[PDB]
Amino acid sequence: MQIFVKTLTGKTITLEVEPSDTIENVKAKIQDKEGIPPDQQRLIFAGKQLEDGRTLSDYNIQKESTLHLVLRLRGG
């Protein structure tokens, strides 16, 4: 499948993945394409945060779906 990833800056990149791929593998591809280390990446899809050890198919991520890179912060 082909999916999209929206980075922290707002840029949209295109990834070629498989629904059986794990979240770590998708984060590694994001690192290969944009240079973002996987320990800094937090992925959101359809409001759900993707946790490590899981695959895309666990979240029903289909073709041309969009993942979002988000910062997670503590409030004041």
Partner: protein
């Protein structure tokens, strides 16, 4: 034909994501809150309210009056500093998902309709 279903599914997915992500006005980065108050200081330094998503300058945006436990403020209607919007946002996400899956079942037929990750 297929492009229309892909467009509708992805639009629903993006609405579900928009109901959870807070976008910064300064740098344009998506934000989610781990814990703490609803006053969010983005990495770029811009402040915003996690509840109404409006740019703010500090704590004067929120209600700072003593409250009786389990009662609304009797002096103002300003955003609460400690209320967790996670439950209401998830109810909104689940309602959008449910209605969109019903619409997809109405369009295609009573036989795959799931849009987004499942429930628990």
């Amino acid at each position: 034909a297929e492009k229309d279903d892909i467009k509708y599914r992805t639009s629903i997915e993006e609405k579900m994501t928009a109901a959870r992500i807070r976008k910064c006005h300064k740098c344009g980065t998506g934000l989610i809150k781990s814990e703490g108050a609803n006053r969010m200081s983005c990495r770029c330094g811009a402040q915003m309210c996690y509840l109404c998503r409006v740019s703010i300058n500090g704590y004067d945006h929120f209600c700072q009056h003593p409250r009786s436990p389990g009662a609304p403020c009797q002096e103002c209607s300003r955003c609460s500093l400690w209320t967790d919007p996670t439950e209401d946002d998830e109810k909104l996400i689940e309602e959008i998902q449910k209605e969109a899956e019903e619409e997809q079942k109405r369009k295609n037929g009573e036989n795959f309709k799931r849009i987004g990750p499942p429930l628990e």
